[PDB]
Symmetry: D2
Subunit: 231 residues, 4 copies
């Protein structure tokens, strides 16, 4: 099984696998049942922002999700990523729909990792049809609206259930190094989740996995394309 560290933007409470009884942002350490979560009012059809921040000094993995009006959810978790993640990882995005669904749209994604100095930095404020520095997975596609649609969409712009999609930066990232004095990464991505369903599902995750990581089978819905299961 993949090793996973995720921030999750979780639109659909699955309270029978850990979720709080609300949409939430959550920090995920090797598990779908978030180490730490926070109430998050996912704003339908509004374009939202995720910042994820971590460094090996403070050893707090942080995440905000805000929307243009200011409503803002913060989750922090105190964890030493050096002990969870392998030295080398791929960094990526993941979204999933279940029995409920939504567009899981990414309008930009940037990522910096730094070892103090080696550094990788990418920003995608657009995406292309053939996004050669992204590895797309499952239902995920780019172009030509310069967006990345993590889960399936349907001719007329309609979110498809049971979809799971994932983009990963193509370069593995050197995410810690034992001699590094500071190992930090941060990620930002803007997303537009629009649903018309009774309830949106299941959300979007930023993630850091072992390099070769791929969707686990049937990890659509509540497993957000990160976990084989909800253990």
């Amino acid at each position: 099984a993949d090793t996973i560290v995720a921030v999750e933007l979780d639109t659909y409470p699955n309270t029978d696998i850990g979720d709080p009884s609300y949409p939430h942002i959550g920090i995920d350490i090797k598990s779908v049942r978030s180490k730490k979560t926070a109430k998050w009012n996912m704003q339908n059809g509004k374009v939202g922002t995720a910042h994820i921040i971590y460094n090996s000094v403070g050893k707090r993995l942080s995440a905000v999700v805000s929307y243009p009006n200011g409503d803002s959810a913060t989750v922090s978790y105190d964890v030493d990523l050096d002990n969870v993640l392998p030295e080398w990882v791929r960094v990526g995005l993941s979204a999933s729909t279940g029995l409920y669904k939504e567009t899981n749209t990414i309008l930009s994604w940037s990522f910096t990792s730094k070892l103090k100095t080696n550094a990788l930095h990418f920003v995608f404020n657009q995406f292309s049809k053939d996004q050669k520095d992204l590895i797309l997975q499952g239902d995920a596609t780019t172009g030509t609206d310069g967006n990345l649609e993590l889960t399936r969409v349907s001719s007329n712009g309609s979110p498809q259930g049971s979809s799971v999609g994932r983009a990963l930066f193509y370069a593995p990232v050197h995410i810690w190094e034992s001699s590094a004095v500071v190992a930090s990464f941060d990620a930002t991505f803007t997303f537009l989740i629009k649903s018309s369903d009774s309830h949106p599902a299941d959300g979007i995750a930023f993630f850091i996995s072992n390099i070769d990581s791929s969707i686990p089978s049937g990890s659509t819905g509540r497993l957000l394309g990160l976990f084989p299961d909800a253990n």
Copy 2:
């Protein structure tokens, strides 16, 4: 009085005004009584590096100091700096000698604040005999060996006593903004602290203060360049 947030590389144990009984790094908020410190073994005549990181999500200020051989010292303090720093600040470096002295040689200094974007970034890997972006104060001087001497050094390479100096970056810095999702800043500087005294003193600080902050009188020893008293 200057509002003052600082990370101190405190070479001299003033065990009667806070200091633990060894050299240490500390996080000072509006008081030289470090809210927190860690044991730092200062390696005389060695070029170390100080990294200071903070963001408004994690709301944790961290600093690590290391030297080429790898002895690290790390301190972290959970604080909302919105609740302490004025919206605009100047950033700087402070150093002080007292009864005992040391070279307080800053070799490089870099700084990044960011509101998420407004950002400021400067890096000085070489200081100039004339540096029109640094506000020099006290006995701090620059050049032309590409270093910033914070406290006085005679013709012969001798640290002076009861010396005090600072270099703030010239532009004021916008360190928070209550509409900002993430206010973050990190700072790095490398220093080449040397003494042949009985015990080095009194160390170097990275500090954030009000835009007009200046050296408080007789702040020259244990007060680094930062506080007017030990309160």
Copy 3:
């Protein structure tokens, strides 16, 4: 007199002091007589973007202006700026109205100089009603719509006549250093130039000047905010 290097977005053809007979971008060195210009079709009421790039290897200053639909104008001029700019400069934005007027709204501005490293970088995607890193001059004001109005605008959104204004970044900038392998800088700003006049005037400039440079009197029209005369 100010030493002045500037890239002008020149909305008004003053065909009697240099201007080609159309709107144009120009590279001005120490004279409003553009060493070179290109035809620029200013799109009224459109948010464009100006990029200015220079390094001391290629020794070529380039600027392109574009708007969301893709009309680009590009000018390039081969010049050693070592041979023109003083070692320290302040960078800024200048705009001017005359007989005819325009909104001179700067939406964002960013700047990078680098000596290879010393570097400075700032980006303003949102200006503040109170911006302690900008030196405002003439009729330039900021906030709180997150823009920099360089020239005067009445209560009702009306550009004023014979108006002049600049915002220089606060810190002086170290633009060259004769020991530097590469002195490079690039600048970006987006502007939201609008007029309902017979012909807009007189446009916006990115400029580099001596640290103490200030608006030359009656430099308000065709002189943008830069020269005291058309020499």
Copy 4:
């Protein structure tokens, strides 16, 4: 055949394939016979710096190679990389020895490419045994001196002839895009060429090639691992 844009740091005049009768830096466009060259005193066992700079506005591909003492060679060439290179490329380093030889050592390599914004940026100030974000080719190796040895070395630190080596960033780079207003890249790398031979050979190249590019067969010596032949 690969498409190649190289800057070459050429230690060995092969005047019967274009080279000037001296060591030189040269710009290479789809050809080993440099479009433009410059005298360059390769300093034996001294650690040198290469900056390569290009943007699609100025359309001058530039390069400096300097050494700690200041001796500095500049080559500039006016070329539109959009017409030579495919949209997607891999960026890399290449070195070769022939009948003559040298260490072709890389101590750091950084690279920024920007489309104006998508951006890729990496810096390697060290390298590791298993440098997962580098694709190594031919004789090229990394670790554990945190260096990259583009051509073979021999137990006791001795340069081997007929060696060709190459490192490429793992992510393809999006090097131009037809809607980009500015497409720029720059690269820096520091190299230590030490020879003890009668004459060093053949030098080091930065290069930008079609993504799948690999050493052409028998492109050691004067072809620097970039070209099938010296056409």
